[PDB]
Amino acid sequence: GCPCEPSYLCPWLPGC
């Protein structure tokens, strides 16, 4: 899924 973990780190990413 989102490459950001936690994904909350990249709110600008819709996938996150």
PDB file of C-alpha atoms in Angstrom:
ATOM      1  CA  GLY A   1       0.000   0.000   0.000  1.00  0.00           C
ATOM      2  CA  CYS A   2       1.268   3.440   0.957  1.00  0.00           C
ATOM      3  CA  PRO A   3       5.115   3.596   1.166  1.00  0.00           C
ATOM      4  CA  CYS A   4       4.777   5.731   4.296  1.00  0.00           C
ATOM      5  CA  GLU A   5       4.771   3.813   7.564  1.00  0.00           C
ATOM      6  CA  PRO A   6       2.971   4.961   9.468  1.00  0.00           C
ATOM      7  CA  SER A   7       1.023   6.242   6.463  1.00  0.00           C
ATOM      8  CA  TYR A   8      -0.234   9.123   8.584  1.00  0.00           C
ATOM      9  CA  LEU A   9       3.199  10.634   7.946  1.00  0.00           C
ATOM     10  CA  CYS A  10       2.153  11.332   4.361  1.00  0.00           C
ATOM     11  CA  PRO A  11      -1.373  12.830   4.551  1.00  0.00           C
ATOM     12  CA  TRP A  12      -0.798  14.437   1.161  1.00  0.00           C
ATOM     13  CA  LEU A  13      -0.863  10.929  -0.292  1.00  0.00           C
ATOM     14  CA  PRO A  14      -4.452   9.746  -1.052  1.00  0.00           C
ATOM     15  CA  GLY A  15      -3.298   6.128  -0.817  1.00  0.00           C
ATOM     16  CA  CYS A  16      -1.957   6.716   2.689  1.00  0.00           C
TER      17      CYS A  16
END
